[PDB]
Design a protein around this ligand. Sequence first.
Ligand SMILES: *[C@@H]1O[C@H](CO)[C@@H](O)[C@H](O)[C@H]1NC(C)=O
Ligand SMILES: [Ca+2]
Length: 476
Amino acid sequence: ATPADWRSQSIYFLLTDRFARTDGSTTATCNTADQKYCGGTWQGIIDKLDYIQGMGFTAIWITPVTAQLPQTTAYGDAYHGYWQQDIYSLNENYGTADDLKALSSALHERGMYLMVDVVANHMGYDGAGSSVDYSVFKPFSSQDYFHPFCFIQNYEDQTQVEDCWLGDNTVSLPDLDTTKDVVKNEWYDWVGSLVSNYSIDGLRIDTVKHVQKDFWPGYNKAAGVYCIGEVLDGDPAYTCPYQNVMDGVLNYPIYYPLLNAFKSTSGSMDDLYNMINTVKSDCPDSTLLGTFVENHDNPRFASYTNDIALAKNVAAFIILNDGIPIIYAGQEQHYAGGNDPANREATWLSGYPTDSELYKLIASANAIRNYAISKDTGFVTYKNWPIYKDDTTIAMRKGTDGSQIVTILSNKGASGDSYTLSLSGAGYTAGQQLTEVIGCTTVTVGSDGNVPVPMAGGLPRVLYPTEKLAGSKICS
Ligand SMILES: *[C@@H]1O[C@H](CO)[C@@H](O)[C@H](O)[C@H]1NC(C)=O
Ligand SMILES: [Ca+2]
């Protein structure tokens, strides 16, 4: 599927090892500190697609599918998929080639997309760099395919970042020489044939900044589908230029201020408001970035605060921001694990309740986005407009004039006081009825064109014209 096809999608990101077992158990042990395979599979995902689709997601992002190092290392198993050795075999822990094809077709039968995580930068090996037997890597079965052994020490030296190895003396990540034509041609043939064999709709590419830029346009072209890169830098001047070589990047620039804004009642709405406007003007296309606050590489949002109103607000933001919403399996059940491995909790241990507070919030937010998009082909290309901020508030507008979603978010938290925020700049006309589609209340635009927004319980407010909700299942 093209970058234009992907603009309207909403992604549920999951760890294949941690989301669903074939036996559908909600009680099988998964102690994250063990760092071992807990038994999740492609078949388990198929069996829980109703759970995912019930929150209004249109797509899933699964962890890499290639065969891994076999060892249980001092850091555990390759349960995460980022330690590949044989790219022409699948990780049999998750199932067979027929199971991955059955997952692609099950998503396609529901009108959903499959996005698959891939690594081009490195292989994985149990042991120090000097111990590596290059013959285990398929097809890169020789030292000749790899950069000379060194670790990245100076992350300010882009040459060392690209040419030296990640990992450490316990688990080595042998760094492919991605400047060699033979490595380019191998990766390019592989990625086109992966997408083609499994009917994959898009790729998330791990570890983009560690591969030199001239590798990426050939890779994105070979895949023949939307590619969203992991470029791990909060500076849009470093990260946004990668959109010149790849369709999308994960919105790490928005991540840091978005987390800060909602993780405490002290959070800076200024830093978030300012970064939205920097990304909107200085990134090649803000509408092809991936918005998130939670993944398997950072502490979960609930690890910073268990305030459910703050979690509702940050989820509403992720879904209503420019670009593609990405929610990480467990976020919807308020999971609170810290850094790796604590943030790889098994989704099944929740029991997959469809009545949890954040399952319901995400369902409501995805419902108005999915609905608004079905009635407004301009929603996804209208750049999100922050129209208001104060110490505890940010409001933003997105969508074609007369159909705009107007979102008011708060970091007051669940103890927040009850008041009326007189909001200017929403662009609706006096007497217009709006539905607040999270709480299903109506608000009427005033004589002066200001919206009297009811604030209470630190709750997020999402406004849309009541007349435009004709015939939708929202707030029935
Ligand atoms: C796709 O299938 C063909 C077998 O026809 C094979 O030549 C190729 O290696 C496969 N690609 C992947 C990535 O499995
Ligand atoms: Ca590299």
